[PDB]
Design a protein around this ligand. Sequence first.
Ligand SMILES: Nc1nc2c(ncn2[C@@H]2O[C@H](COP(=O)(O)OP(=O)(O)OP(=O)(O)O)[C@@H](O)[C@H]2O)c(=O)[nH]1
Ligand SMILES: Nc1ncnc2c1ncn2[C@@H]1O[C@H](COP(=O)(O)OP(=O)(O)OP(=O)(O)O)C[C@H]1O
Ligand SMILES: [Mg+2]
Ligand SMILES: [Zn+2]
Lengths: 86, 122, 48, 97, 166, 89, 99, 50, 76, 34
Amino acid sequence: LPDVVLKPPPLFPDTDYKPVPLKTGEGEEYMLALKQELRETMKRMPYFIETPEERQDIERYSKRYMKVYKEEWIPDWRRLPREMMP
Amino acid sequence: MEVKDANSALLSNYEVFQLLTDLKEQRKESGKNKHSSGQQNLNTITYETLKYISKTPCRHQSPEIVREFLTALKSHKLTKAEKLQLLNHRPVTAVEIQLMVEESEERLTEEQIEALLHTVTS
Amino acid sequence: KEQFRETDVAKKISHICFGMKSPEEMRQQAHIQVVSKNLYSQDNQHAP
Amino acid sequence: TEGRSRDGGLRLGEMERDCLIGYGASMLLLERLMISSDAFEVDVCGQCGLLGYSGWCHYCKSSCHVSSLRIPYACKLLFQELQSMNIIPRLKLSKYN
Amino acid sequence: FVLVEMVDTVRIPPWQFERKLNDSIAEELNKKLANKVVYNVGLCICLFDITKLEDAYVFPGDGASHTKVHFRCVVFHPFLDEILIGKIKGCSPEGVHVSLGFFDDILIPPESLQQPAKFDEAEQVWVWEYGEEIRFRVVDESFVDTSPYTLVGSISEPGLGLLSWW
Amino acid sequence: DLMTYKGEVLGITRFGLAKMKESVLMLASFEKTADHLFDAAYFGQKDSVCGVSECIIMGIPMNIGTGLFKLLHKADRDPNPPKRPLIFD
Amino acid sequence: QGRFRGNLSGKRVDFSGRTVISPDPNLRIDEVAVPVHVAKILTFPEKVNKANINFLRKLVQNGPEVHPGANFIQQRHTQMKRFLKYGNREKMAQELKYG
Amino acid sequence: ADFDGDEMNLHLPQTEEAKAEALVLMGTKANLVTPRNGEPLIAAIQDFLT
Amino acid sequence: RITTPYMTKYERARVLGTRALQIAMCAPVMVELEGETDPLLIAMKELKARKIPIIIRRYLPDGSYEDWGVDELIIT
Amino acid sequence: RCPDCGSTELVEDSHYSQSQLVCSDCGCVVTEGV
RNA sequence: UGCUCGC
Ligand SMILES: Nc1nc2c(ncn2[C@@H]2O[C@H](COP(=O)(O)OP(=O)(O)OP(=O)(O)O)[C@@H](O)[C@H]2O)c(=O)[nH]1
Ligand SMILES: Nc1ncnc2c1ncn2[C@@H]1O[C@H](COP(=O)(O)OP(=O)(O)OP(=O)(O)O)C[C@H]1O
Ligand SMILES: [Mg+2]
Ligand SMILES: [Zn+2]
């Protein structure tokens, strides 16, 4: 008969097989660097719409100095249906 | 118990002083034994806030004076926070407006300070 | 000084939403894992 | 309990409940079947809809949405048995107003 | 100081029915919101006024009078740049302990921005010379119940000059 | 009229009662407890407390009888009381 | 004997009695005769107010032995019940607060 | 009932609201007629008719 | 104003119950009771004297409501 | 001990099929129901 | 759990 266990099995049981090391070369490193560059450059892209901040405490003279300015892309309303015009 | 707006409208210390005086007089005219024994923190906070306001120059104020001060400062294009701080502090010295009051650069003009002092002292 | 927290609210149940739980939700809801098939100890006190 | 030797109480059967319904006495039925028989106060979490203990929800590991609620003890037993049967009743609480 | 709009379900017992409803509502709201800090709001002082007061129900349970009341109450919450005048109610080596006059002993100014002669040697020494002013910087709140304070704020003391007191 | 209000004569048996009623708790309490409960858990059907049986089970006053209406207190009050004027704004 | 039929729709309650019936024409149609023995067991919680204070005082003074009386007193401030069979019932009656 | 050994139950409400609802809705004087056909059930019986 | 002007027995029972529960909790009396130690008797006296400060809020099934005073309704 | 008077005269006296541990001096019901 | 009863 199977023996009784006093404590539950470990949350992460150990394994004798380890993951194979990743492939190396100029190609993998270049792809990694390019993915990092895309991560860094796509957040500042106008397509990356951020959450609109709200509930401003007060209005100040420094508002014009701290006003965030960013160019906005103009969608082609000819292909897009009329329901998405602002 | 949710709040609708935590920044609905800013008010100066004079309104708080008037509200505290009114609540104090209504309490001393309608003192209840069990109501007071249930929560004594009300009396403490009201009395101590009234004492703190009395320590400030917030006395000798009236709604007409506040309206006149607001109408005088409306011509100086100042923000609501600056006039609120000037009313709550009542600066008698110029250095309070020169350095302590924020947004000093390009706003003092070295000529408007005398008018600000004359208005706040009147 | 003191934070304002509500003591008791007159909560009324509106409706009962029946459903199912995933094994992960079963693990999260439960407190301990039952692995021993026996009930009481070997001692004469017979503690669980 | 059931019997007199066990110091038991009289049972309001299904037909008695039907008669009380026909009379329209909602408060009397509530006092008999809930207040005077198996009244209890449980803690329900308004986020996940599960039953908590001592004003604390172990499922969400929080206590802000936990609120007290009056309930028959048999109803809580039924809810627990259903949770044991993988039929999870999620209670969406709301103010009495 | 700022007004906050709140909606509360106040329960008045039947032995207060001879009293006027608005007066008892105001008293109960003041007793419930005195010397307490509402999260992400600030420390409420007292009730300012009652704007909307709808019908008063009576539940088949407790039997008291439950009223949903819309009111405006005053709270102490700076706008991250307000100037205050407090008194030094103590001092620690890592920072002075200034308290607004009998209002709240929660203002903890960090001593990391004054002219480079800043230190507290546990003898209540404020600052080596060349009514205490305060510039609120940020608000911060925290919870209390986590098992089966809440407002400190940071204070700035820049090179204000202070011709009256160093 | 109750038997002939959905356009089809539905009996008082469990099938007609299921076709007429919608409350899961009452269907489970009458007959076929486990089957109805498992079907509701599968469908995720939210059951309200509008019915009398669920009101009795959950320990709340039923909507029928004296609980159809609500009572109000004739307390001395003044709706929309005068508001304190704001001087600074 | 399931939960729905035996514990939810129809369940057992306390503050109830069961007795054999006997005829009595000298009582009104809206009145029913209760034995003294059952009346001493089935209790009703009355709240102390400005109207029945002097009646509840005498009821407490009588005690759980005399038929017109009470068995337990629950204070307004603390919910710790007090048995009337022990202790000075007169002191309890003199200290009957409203509520 | 026929007074030949029948045992009857007697319940005491623990709420003023329940007591009032019982006295008003389930009062003996207010239920002298059955809702089936309006005929009075509480009436004279044997040894009262004779 | 469209419902029945007569006060039903369910409304009577609920109003009497609420008034008795209030009076039992130290509520003020408006009929000057004369040695009535039972709160339900005081509630019935107030109902007969038409001095109960309770307004019934009759709700229509669609959602509309209407307020009726106890003194405004007709008792039997 | 009794929570009201502090006495140690806690007697288990069942009153009409109700198990109840109650103080014997002031009559304060310590525990009730089983 | 069984069973004999009480209407
Ligand atoms: N053979 C037999 N079975 C019984 C007896 N009492 C109970 N049972 C079984 O147990 C079930 C009912 O249990 P209960 O009578 O509620 O047990 P209980 O009275 O709560 O037990 P205690 O808590 O010890 O009083 C039935 O389905 C029976 O099969 C008995 O005296 N003899
Ligand atoms: N199985 C049962 N279910 C419901 N009620 C019952 C049952 N057995 C007895 N009773 C109660 O007893 C009563 C039955 O009496 P009834 O049948 O009318 O007279 P009887 O027993 O025929 O007497 P006679 O033989 O006519 O002298 C009515 C009912 O309330
Ligand atoms: Mg018989
Ligand atoms: Zn949760």
